[PDB]
Structures are given as structure tokens and as C-alpha cells.
């Protein structure tokens, strides 16, 4: 058989729908302004990362080589020797942040995991799954974790070794959990640093923190033990994918071995997506630092503006520091259908992804906001 | 920036690599023989299926009414109803067994899950994961569970509500665990067949049975409760996928919602591939039930030809019923190195993938099998 008139039609509208779409995304953090044209020609091949990148694979149609180099960028680029280092290019966020609980949970298998009211929707998931315990912790009106309800759950729940998912670009307010003083304070209960674990959700922020003048904390020098990155958001990918960074200790510390049956390896998937680590690897080796700080300057002026912009008439829109996500109150259905926009909260936002070249989209998207406000 | 001279290179070296390699695979079940060039050109666009495909996305760039179809065309292929069935297209066989077990998991937090010596190694991080009671149950020399031990341990446990891991087509001997027997030994014991979990790690031969003229058990016909299938495997991707299909009833009974924060679905996953969905789309609308069937045939056929070929030599070979996983005794380093074999149990196999379009490769692979039995 060959495709049906019929199913060559739906193929080919869709491409007519993609064309026309390509650049809608006004709402969300998927950065759209990515080339991997050179890397299509690869989908010739059944490329498969299965295992471990750093070890021996007999399916010989995998990219490890490139992954390894990825891998050495992020340890570069979140401070911590490649050497000390462990994790690979995942499915998602959400994979790489399932991983660092599970590390957490397997190094303090009665610790509890505590979050924020602003964690992404994601945590429930990881939860559920994992059988881990977990306690919700109260926000700012910011979208930060409430520090001072942290500490007093912690006091009163005698917690020995609390499990932090520390949320670095919250995703409704762009808020960053401050890791320092989440340590500074549970140091201050006594608990010893080596005694509890923090994983850093760093989905959209991971690649905005370091190539902005003054990073709150959010890497190995800052003390996380891990941290979690989309490769689709602030990057841009055709599929989606993320990177996971652990500490090498902490990993060979747990044990994947069930009555009879190993794993060779301590990833959470099978099969692993081989094209995802070349297009991670075309994004970073094509990217120079100055080029990634341009495209974030860029992102946080337009942002700027849009605040400005919004303040200017009678709305309250705020962003946070270092953040490409603006707040403002909820408008009415009619707009955040029309703008196809993330609403909760009583609140809304537009994120400045880098494939806003000019203020256009976002103009027409404020004038539609004070047009609803009257 | 744009990308070296290094580091194009380094691209370029890889292509030859896999032009080189493109069809190296003897040892493993992934088919490389497909097409899919006409969908490279959708790698322009930040597609991204996050969320169920039933319901609605502001994420506008998704395949969600493709991958509809995928799900109508895997329902009616494994004969449950589309209005019964729930699943999605999803990162692997992993994901899918992990999803089929979760469900096990929460319709009975109590039940042991039972898998056989011969259950692939994704099941002891599947176990891991999601804090699940467990059991180990001896093998036949088949590869299939014994059966016999199974009931003697879900007696001996007082076991209620057994949740059967049911390997269709062992990763090794291409054994098939008899899921008829299974369910009339467990009613022998008095358990109600609503009281207990069948999941379908159906990876390989998901794909192979619908397409044979006396099938084992393996669809909802034959009384399972979920399947996971991967696509990478016996269709054939560039990309790891998976399809996983659960009873729409078993779906609802369970609840995703921790202290606060919902999950808005009930995929186990966040941001979604959305162009694997494509692949298997144009795979299943570009192959008729008879293309799929020549392709197994030919298959068949060659394992069949491989068991001859090595038994007419003094090598015990042989192959289980609608397998093309031939099974012989380990041969020496230089062979399974040589040939990129899967080696284990003092067992090694080989796999006749469709991209075998004669017996050549097959052919010089027995011949050094042969040449190293002496």
C-alpha cells in the first residue's frame, strides 16, 4: 500500500495548519526560533540511546559521543566537574525531575518531599508514582515558597531529612525558590547539609540563569544536589526533551538490582531518543555564550516592555527578576481562548520566547488585555 | 555562531557511520526498514502533545487528531471497543509498562505483581519507581512463566488480588506466557478474574500475533486488562515510541490529584512527542493488515530457515511458536562482539527484523556460529 488520497489531504492541511501556526505560542515557554534542518537527513536511521551514554552499547546506531559532549556542556555550565557529574538527555522535565526525587527518595527513603503551591502540575505525577511522602507548603503572593512555613513544617513534623523540589521559574509566576536561604534555614533547625536533598525543577530557567548578570541560586556551587531542564523551552526543539544533572556519588550510592533481575544502568527509560542529543548538541555548539546572552536579553527588554506597557493603563502586571514570564489579572474567555493563553489563579501571563523578534504579538495581545479591562 | 569546522566534521563522520550501519542490526527487534521522509520536514515546528489527545490544548502545534487514529487503529487491531479503550503514544514499551502496572498498582496498593526469570530488565526499574510488592516466579526452559510456580506462590502468599506481569515475547527466547492457562489456574483458586491485574508486556510481538494465523492469548479478547507495545521495534522508528492501551473503566477508577495540585490527565508524562504519533500515523495508514502480514511471513519464514540451517549442523537451535527470535547456544567473545549480539543465560539469539530482505546476513552469522563449534 501506499497513503490513500484521503490521509496525503490530512497530512498535508496539517503542514498548512503548522505553517500558519509556527509561531503562535505567545503563552507558554516553548521558544520556536530553532534550526535543526542539517539533522532531518538522520531519520533515515533507527537511532536508539538505550543504557548509559558513558558505557559500551551494541546497538550501534546511537549518538553516546554526542550526548557525552551535551552532558559535558551542562556540567560546565551548572558548575560542577564533569568527573563529579551523572545524567543524560531525557523525554522531558518532568523524566529529569522524576529522576532527582527518586535519587532523593532512594538516598532518604522516609524523608518528605516538601513544595510549593506554585510546583508545577508535573509533582503530582512524580508523587503518585513514587509512593513518596510529601508535604505542600504555602507560597508568597511572589509564587516563592513561604520559607518560614517550610521551616515550621518541618520543626513540627521532626523531619530528619526533608526532601526540598525546589522550584527555579515557577511556571504561572516565573518565581525562583531561593536555595540559599532555604539552607541557610534549615541549617539553622541543625539539620547538616549531607543529612537532606534539593532537587532544582529548572524546566524553563536552567537556560536563562546563566547568561544574566546577577543568577539567583540554582547550580552545584550553589549547593543543589540536582537539577532538571526542558530542552524545548528556552532553547527550542522540535520534540520534546530534557537534561538531567546529578551528583556522581549519589547515583552509585542506590541500587536498581530486583530479586534476579539487574538493570546494566540507572536511567528510568528503555529505549532512549538518540536525535534529541543531536539536536541539544547543534543548539549548544552553534550557541557561543554572548549568542544565548543576546537571545535572553532580548526576551527580558520585551518582557520589560510589556510591564511598562501594562502599568502605563490601569493594570497591575508584574515580573519577577531575571524572568521572561509578565503576570497580569485574569481577562475574560473571549481573550485567553483568542490568545491561547495559560489562566489560573485569577491570574494569566505571556511569556517573551525568543521567537518574538519585534513587540507586535505581544502589542496586540496587551491592547486586547485594556480593550477587555473597560 | 554557526556550527566548526570541527564539529561539522564531527556531524559528518557520524553520517557515513550510519550509512555504514544503517542495517547492522542481527541481534536486536528493531526493524529498520521504513520510510518516513516525508514527515522529516514537520521537525521545523515546536510540536508537542502534552496532555490527553481526547481533550482539548491551547499548545496548538500538536498531532493530537493523528494520534487519535493511531489509538482507533490499536483498539480495533487488540478488540476492545475505541469508546472502552484509554492510551496514548508514548516514549517506549517502558513508559507503556510502567502505565499498565500503575493502573494494576492503584486498582489494587496491596497486590503482589508476579513476572517470570525471563521478564526484560525495564521491570526491575519499573518495580523500583513505583514501590510495588513483587515476586519472582520461575521460568520453563521455554522462557514462558511456570505456571505451576505461580499458582504455588500466589497460594502460599494468600494472595487476593495478583497483578500477572505477562511477558508476550521474552526478550531472549520470544516465549510467549499463556494467558488463557493463566486465568483459568488463578480461577481454580477461587479468584475472581475482576479481583486481579493482567498487564501485556507485548513490546516486540504486539506486532507480530494480529498478523498470524493461530495466535496465542494476547488482546482483550483474551481477557488482559492493559498492553504496551513498542514502536521502534517490530513497525519500525527512527525514534524510540510506544503504544500502551488500558480499559477506559480501570482509567477513571483512579485519581491523580495530590494536596492541592491536580494533574488536568492522566498520561504519566508531561510534554508528549508529538511526531512519533505522526510515524506510527503514516506506518498504519501506509500498511494494510496483508503488507504487515507478508512482512511477518518473511520474517517467520527466515527464523525458520536459521533453526534448519544450524540444526543440520550439531548446534541445538530452535525458535518458539510465531517468534523470528532464533535461540542457540553462546558462542565465543570474537563471534558476539563481531556480530553486536545479545548474549545471556549461556544462550545468545538472533532476530530476523524485516529489514532481512534475504538470507545473506543471517546466512554469514550461522556460518561463524558453526565455524566456532569446533
Known sequence: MTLSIENQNKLDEFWAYCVKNQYFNIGYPESADFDYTILERFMRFSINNCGD??????????????????????????????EDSWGYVTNGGTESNMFGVYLGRELFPDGTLYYSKDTHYSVAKIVKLLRIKSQLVDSLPNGEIDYDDLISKIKQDDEKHPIIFANIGTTVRGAIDDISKIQAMIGELGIKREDYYIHADAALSGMILPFVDEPQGFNFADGIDSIGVSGHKMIGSPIPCGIVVAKKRNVDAISVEIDYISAHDKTITGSRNGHTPLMMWVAVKSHSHADFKRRINRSLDLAQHAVQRLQTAGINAW??????????????????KKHCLATSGGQAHLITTAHHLDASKVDALIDDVIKDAN
Open 53 to 82: 551514554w558513558a558505557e559500551y552499547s551494541n546497538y550501534l546506531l546511537n549518538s553516546f559521543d554526542f550526548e557525552k559532549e551535551v552532558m559535558e556542556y551542562f556540567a560546565d555550565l551548572f558548575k560542577i566537574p564533569f
Open 319 to 336: 515580573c519577577n527578576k531575571n524572568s521572561i514570564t509578565v503576570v497580569f489579572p485574569c481577562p475574560s474567555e473571549a481573550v485567553w
